[PDB]
Amino acid sequence: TFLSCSQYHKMYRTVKAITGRQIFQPLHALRNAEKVLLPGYHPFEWQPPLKNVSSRTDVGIIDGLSGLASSVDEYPVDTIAKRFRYDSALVSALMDMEEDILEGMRSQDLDDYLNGPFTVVVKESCDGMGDVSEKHGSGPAVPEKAVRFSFTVMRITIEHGSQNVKVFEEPKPNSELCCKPLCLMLADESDHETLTAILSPLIAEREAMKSSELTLEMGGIPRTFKFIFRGTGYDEKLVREVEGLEASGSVYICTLCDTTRLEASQNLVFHSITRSHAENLQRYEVWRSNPYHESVEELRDRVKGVSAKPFIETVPSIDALHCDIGNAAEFYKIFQLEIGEVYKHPNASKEERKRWQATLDKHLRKRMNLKPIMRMNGNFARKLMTQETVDAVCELIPSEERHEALRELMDLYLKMKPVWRSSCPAKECPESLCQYSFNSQRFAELLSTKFKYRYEGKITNYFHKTLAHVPEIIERDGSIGAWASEGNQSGNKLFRRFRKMNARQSKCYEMEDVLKHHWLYTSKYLQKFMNAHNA
Amino acid sequence: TFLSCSQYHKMYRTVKAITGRQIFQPLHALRNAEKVLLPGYHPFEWQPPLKNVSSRTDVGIIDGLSGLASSVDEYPVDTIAKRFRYDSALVSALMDMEEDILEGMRSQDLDDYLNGPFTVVVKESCDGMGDVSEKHGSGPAVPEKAVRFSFTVMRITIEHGSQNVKVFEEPKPNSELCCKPLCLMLADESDHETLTAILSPLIAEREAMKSSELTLEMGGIPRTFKFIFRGTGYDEKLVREVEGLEASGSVYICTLCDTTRLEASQNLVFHSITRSHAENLQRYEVWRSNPYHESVEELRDRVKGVSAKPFIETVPSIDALHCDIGNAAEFYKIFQLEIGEVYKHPNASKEERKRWQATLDKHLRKRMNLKPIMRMNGNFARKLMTQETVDAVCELIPSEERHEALRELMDLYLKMKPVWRSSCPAKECPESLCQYSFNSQRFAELLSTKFKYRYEGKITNYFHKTLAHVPEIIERDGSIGAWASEGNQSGNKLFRRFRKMNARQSKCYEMEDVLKHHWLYTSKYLQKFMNAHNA
DNA sequence: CGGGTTTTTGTTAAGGGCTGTATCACTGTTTAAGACAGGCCAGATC
DNA sequence: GATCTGGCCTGTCTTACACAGTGATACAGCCCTTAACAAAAACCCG
DNA sequence: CGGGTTTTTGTCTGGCTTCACACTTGATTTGCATCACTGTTTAAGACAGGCCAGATC
DNA sequence: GATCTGGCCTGTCTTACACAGTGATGCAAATCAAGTGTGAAGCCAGACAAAAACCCG
């Protein structure tokens, strides 16, 4: 309810004095019940012990700088940052859902008194937010950016009998209140030095606990958990940055296969994922070393635009959210270009196209009340992307064979969108999946011919991904929509709301508070209560 | 507690599902319990009727523009503004404090069923809070201002037999939560045409209900109320604006006596109070008409600086908040001067000035943790005006006697501060009240002799009001602290909060929501629920 | 008026468990509008 | 050409222009109990 | 070890009890959806020509 | 002289950067409000007779 302590105390004492009873509990009984829900409360132990990681079990909110050298002699740093220790936070996230683990265990007809090697599958994701500053006073202070690194327990399995059974699977994976916060920093997500300064310890802890087993007493008996991390909720820019690629405008487009934007137009769907992390460390080594004594423009070809040391280990994936938003903006542009009738007379001016845009947006907020937006958002993408939109915009272009072509294009795009928009297209839409190959090869066909005034050279990133990589990503990892960044893209509102209503402005405590409240919010032993009206 | 409706409903359904009972009430129950506490619910009857005011009794929140013609052909107005009708507001206030004034008659050994002509004494306060905007997106561009005209039932008094007994007196007169809001608008306080367009109807209503008697059934038996309005919650700026006086930096300084700054410095404390509202209207008539055919520079002597038509009827009084802030800032200036020994070597340059300022700032921050600031608030003025602060700053002057010449000065200013700052100096500090004349006269001598290097010509306005008019404003009104703008100055907080936490962004509903919620917050039938824990 | 009784009450101090409220460290990071007085140029004028 | 006078420009001044609200910590009451000893009306009993 | 002493149960037929509960039908409350409205661009970075300007044969 | 080439200038094109939350309406479902006599689930009757948990020769 985003109440504060003074307001909760007002309500407490008022209900108490009126009713006579004590319906709400006092504040200290909330601090005590809170100590149980943060990390740093339960006893756990690793085996073998974690290399370079402490052994204590009461480690709460650590300073994020990790003892970063802060004097007037080292590289200047003022980015305040708080975090959890990865292992203790993961333990807390598991004993926050002990009850659901046990319930799923019973549901799968398993002996509730079991302690097998529970294989957890976590999905971690960082996403830098912008302009988290405010106006606490008479002044427009400054642009202030933040970065949240967060994770989520995606799926818990056990190796019972001779197989694996889902003891637990996240209901809505990319939701604002199942993405647990792990690190909060106030820094530009492209300030590579400070970013690595903050995130290096977390990657260290992650690499450490990737190779051991966690003993944790869970409701009586102790259980042994094994972890498998999957960094997937990184948007395209953060993938190209952390993994050590060149910026998005390069010749090398796909962060999953090493193909060049040009040759990605002569051949649209015959690629295969070949951009791992080990290979990219190897390619950076070849770059920095240059053992074949090549020129810059030959060494680039040798190492496929890798000119930086891969920092975090991500996995090849496509970010369904930004994939769909980019496709929608792309279609907005193609609608404008169809209005301009460019397929017959090219090379208009830098204002004829603006007039075409005016035509389009007037017609749209006259035939749909679809208000124009200068920043493409998923809402405008859902509203735009319909067969009704070509149904409308057909009456703005003179020829009708363009109606036919664009109608067919929209048909194929909507016929394939669910396969990467769902959260389990193996069962939710298996016909679309088993026909994706054909329904996208013909989409590429019709992009080759009836739009070659655009797709002769440059074909954008997300179209290449959407067309050529989706089926094998599915055959590799189940779905595409679940493994996305929508979860970490919602919590910006929570960040701002907590920093406004529940904080202490001290610039040192003021971040512990946000981190703590967002942790509590995304808890589950509490959502069990706030969802009590569903019996 | 400032809950939304979604949040309140969430808490409601949670408690209902957990407990199983129903402690909180559904939203519709609260809307029904709200329709009773807003104005435009009870029946009332003016006798004789109110000239130019309707007779309906169910008029609540209405467009503040009062049907101001808004076409392309009229003077363009764009200010959103909501208001209550003044009589409806007073009726709701009275049948809100019904229980309290019944208890008052009980305590005063009167009859519950007594229907004497209750004379009410209401305070009027209008304050133009500024910068009430927030950044919705990107761009700090537009600052927007606001104005809230409000009132406060200050005392209620029945004329039992042949004596007036105080059935009710406000405990905290200038408090956050008894200043009932009446009208509020988004417009500069000095956009004089808009301000008059909005406040002309309200003035019409408060002029209508000055020769009538509200008949209102209160706890069964009907009662006859009869009003006295006093406009006092006005900062110097609006006083001068809506009385038809020259801007505050003129030669005619006091809004109570018509005297020149030079003559104020020659004669420090012997003035009377000789500037009413009818006198202002009559002097404006002299101005506009110019009956004696004389040039501007002696006509302005004839009309003592009245060159505009008076708009509202305010009373001759001094604010207290701005009074002590101004006097404290003037002592701060005297300190910056004494550090530099301006008396020995006058006419320095505009670098030693800032040097003196930074000297005093660093010194005070070192000695008292009194971190300096630019906008001098009330906490700064509170801390700075202490005998300890002069005892500290006294260690920065090479002189031997300026020590005592500041010690005595601060001594007398402190002997004077309670006299006006008190909400009833008669029975809180009558010794200060009977010595105030002597203390102010000695203070005046001290400024005139050991500080003539500053107060030879210019003497600021507040060192005229404070010095020469307090011992008569007291004898005319009682206190000075009660009749002040603090109650309104505080409510500004609430506005901003409401405007972001309880509103509809509709730019038409988004203001009546703020106004309704502020009326509720200011109610009393609810404050004696949120104060149940004490009693 | 008493006067044995009830019938209930007043009191002590240590230590703890609990609860309610006050206190604490801390965060804003220059005004804008108008009045008047010089002072110096700048042009009107003898 | 010399001189008298007004206009413009800065420059000082005087009124305003958003700090109470956040979580955490610290006291200050305040009741429960040991065990006994004494104390206001409540009231028949004499 | 299997046999024996606790807690704990079945157990009496009677009369008792509170209270759910039959069976309408409209006047209320309560739940859960809708609804109209709000924000009013880019900012770094890659690649490509193209023009010009200075170098070189 | 004549041309080549390299540097700077825009000029497009790529990924990215803030919309669910406000108070209001408005129908569907629930309940509930009486009627009046029912039976049903326990209550408890002091005292008596077949089982689980553990002592005991």
Ligand SMILES: [Ca+2]
């Ligand atoms: Ca991002």
Ligand SMILES: [Ca+2]
């Ligand atoms: Ca994001």
Ligand SMILES: [Ca+2]
């Ligand atoms: Ca003001």
Ligand SMILES: [Ca+2]
């Ligand atoms: Ca104010």
Ligand SMILES: [Zn+2]
């Ligand atoms: Zn690819």
Ligand SMILES: [Zn+2]
């Ligand atoms: Zn005066």
